[PDB]
Design an enzyme around this catalytic site. Structure first.
Site, mmCIF file in Angstrom:
data_model
loop_
_atom_site.group_PDB
_atom_site.id
_atom_site.type_symbol
_atom_site.label_atom_id
_atom_site.label_comp_id
_atom_site.label_asym_id
_atom_site.label_seq_id
_atom_site.Cartn_x
_atom_site.Cartn_y
_atom_site.Cartn_z
ATOM 1 N N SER A 245 1.033 -1.179 0.012
ATOM 2 C CA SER A 245 -0.115 0.117 -0.055
ATOM 3 C C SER A 245 0.892 1.198 -0.087
ATOM 4 O O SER A 245 2.076 1.236 0.281
ATOM 5 C CB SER A 245 -0.996 -0.046 1.208
ATOM 6 N N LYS A 246 -0.003 2.358 -0.278
ATOM 7 C CA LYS A 246 0.817 3.799 -0.529
ATOM 8 C C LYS A 246 1.521 4.112 0.810
ATOM 9 O O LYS A 246 2.372 5.081 0.950
ATOM 10 C CB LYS A 246 -0.251 4.619 -1.318
#
Ligand SMILES: Nc1ncnc2c1ncn2[C@@H]1O[C@H](COP(=O)(O)OP(=O)(O)OP(=O)(O)O)[C@@H](O)[C@H]1O
Ligand SMILES: [Mg+2]
EC number: 6.1.1.17
Length: 468
Positions: A245-246
């Site tokens: 994820s970011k």
RNA sequence: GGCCCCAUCGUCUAGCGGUUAGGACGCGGCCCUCUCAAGGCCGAAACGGGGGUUCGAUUCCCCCUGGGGUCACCA
């Protein structure tokens, strides 16, 4: 033949997960002398990020993947942007409607929430609405959606080419919405319709879609179409094993390109995410990947994206795969971004040659070699300490240097070694302080080559400022 | 929580019934050496647990545990 595809969603920066899945679809098609399609999934007008389609298409080209059909290369089965295929989905949705495989549902977004709260998930209550009444409420323009009418009760067999058969219980398969109330379709409807029309035979996608597969199997059945083969790839994982994820990782391909990672290196690392060569070799080309590809050598564990290993690999490409000249070219943008300039190609190349084994990302070059392109470089406390501690020696060496005619790495070494012996001291005691004078650092490439690179004048000038 | 997938060193992985369980990143030591790297050499580091099947299991089957995914008018 074999036809694969990628269905990127233009809803954010170009995602490494996309590159990863694209890498495998590209290879599988090329390996079988087939086609690799690019279709844009822009059916969610809410999450649509303008300018994201171009970016993803550029990143794929940046990594070295080439597609046979797509938005910007044309193809026999366009459009290749789903937003431009809306009437198509409308048409097929109504076809299911007429075949009894779907139905119209008019619940407001708030009733559905209440239904989900009480009975957890929609209960397919709209199936009890008389078709003629639904058809009428539709013509009156009443807002609604079209849902897949799952056969109840029952079972649905899905086949994943890498895990084997998986029998699902229809009670697990929800009457998913096929066509939203705004006339836009969901991935479920558009995926099947478009994969069919564009003739894709091998659907390779992230494991996050495994559970949705029985919905697609059902739709292919509803349409009377033959289902393609399914290959689910494991998800790339953050260091904590959760799907990348970011926030726990760097998922934007633009960040990688910005940081100085070579597309070749990144693409090569991505192949190692679930695949390995028979001989266990880790550095290989995109073409070698295509030729050696086999679903037999694809592991199914959720691989962690290890940045440290990517850096290692990037450095490996910089010093063993690309030529000296290629690195020199790729480093230019980064010098420009650092407000630095090289005097000529000849100079830059020799500068890059000296540093090749000392930088693992193109961005690092201007950082560690700053003193080779400008006078505005920093001086480490340790370098300063070393400079002041050797001033007496440098002072006595300077006259020898201004009188040195042959300014070569061979001649310079001879002079300095001789000076060190004649002064009864170890070379390092004269080389170390000189390095500090010349580079403002104590971590640099060989002294003789650094001393030579600049030329007599430029070197003495700089040496004079440290003695002044 | 229901359903589904997965299971070798910290991480990426090779094993496809019998191996001292191999490689790579990272980590420690050494060598090279004018510094720092690069490179070479050496080393520490793994089969989650319990049943089985089998002459023999890391390899095959089952339960457990663990991890992950998925449960929308996002994909
Ligand atoms: N995090 C991820 N890790 C691995 N594969 C991914 C990931 N996200 C998407 N994919 C896969 O890569 C392909 C492209 O995905 P996509 O362009 O939709 O990006 P996305 O991250 O899924 O964005 P969205 O939020 O719209 O789902 C797909 O076929 C999907 O299976
Ligand atoms: Mg061992």
């Amino acid at each position: 033949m074999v036809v694969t595809r990628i269905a990127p969603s233009p809803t954010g920066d170009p995602h490494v997960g996309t590159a990863y899945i694209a890498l495998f679809n590209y290879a599988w098609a090329r390996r079988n002398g087939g086609r690799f399609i690019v279709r844009i999934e822009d059916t969610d007008r809410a999450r649509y990020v303008p300018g994201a389609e171009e970016r993803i298409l550029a990143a794929l080209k940046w990594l070295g993947l080439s597609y046979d059909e797509g938005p910007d290369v044309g193809g026999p089965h366009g459009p290749y942007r789903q937003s431009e295929r809306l009437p198509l989905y409308q048409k097929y949705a109504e076809e299911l409607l007429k075949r009894g495989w779907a139905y119209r549902a008019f619940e407001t977004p708030e009733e559905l929430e209440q239904i989900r709260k009480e009975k957890g998930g929609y209960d397919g209550r709209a199936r009890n609405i008389p078709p003629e009444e639904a058809e009428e409420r539709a013509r009156r323009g009443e807002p609604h959606v079209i849902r897949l009418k799952v056969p109840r009760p029952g079972t649905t067999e899905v086949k994943d080419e890498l895990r084997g058969v998986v029998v699902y219980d229809n009670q697990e398969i929800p009457d998913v919405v096929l066509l939203k109330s705004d006339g836009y379709p969901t991935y479920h409807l558009a995926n099947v319709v478009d994969d069919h029309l564009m003739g894709v035979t091998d659907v390779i996608r992230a494991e996050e879609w495994l559970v949705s597969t029985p919905i697609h199997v059902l739709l292919y059945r509803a349409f009377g179409w033959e289902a393609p083969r399914f290959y689910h790839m494991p998800l790339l994982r953050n260091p904590d094993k959760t799907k990348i994820s970011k926030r726990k990782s760097h998922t934007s391909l633009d960040w990688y390109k910005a940081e100085g990672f070579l597309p070749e290196a990144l693409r090569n690392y991505l192949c190692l995410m679930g695949f390995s060569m028979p001989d266990g070799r880790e550095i290989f080309t995109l073409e070698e990947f295509i030729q050696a590809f086999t679903w037999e050598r694809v592991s199914l564990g959720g691989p962690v994206f290890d940045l440290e290993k990517l850096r290692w690999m990037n450095g490996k490409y910089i010093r063993e795969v690309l030529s000296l000249e290629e690195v020199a070219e790729r480093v230019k943008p980064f010098l420009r971004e650092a407000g630095l300039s090289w005097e000529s190609e000849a100079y830059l190349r020799r500068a890059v040659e000296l540093m090749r084994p000392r930088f693992d990302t193109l961005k690092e070059f201007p950082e560690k070699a700053r003193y080779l392109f400008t006078e505005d470089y920093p001086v480490s406390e340790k370098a300063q300490r070393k400079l002041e501690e050797g001033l007496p020696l440098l002072k006595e060496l300077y006259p020898r240097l201004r009188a040195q005619e042959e300014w070569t790495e061979a001649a310079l070494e001879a002079l300095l070694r001789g000076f060190a012996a004649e002064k009864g001291v170890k070379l390092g005691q004269v080389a170390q302080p000189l390095r500090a004078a010349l580079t403002g650092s104590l971590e640099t490439p060989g002294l003789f080559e650094i001393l030579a690179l600049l030329g007599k004048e430029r070197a003495l000038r700089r040496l004079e400022r440290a003695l002044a």
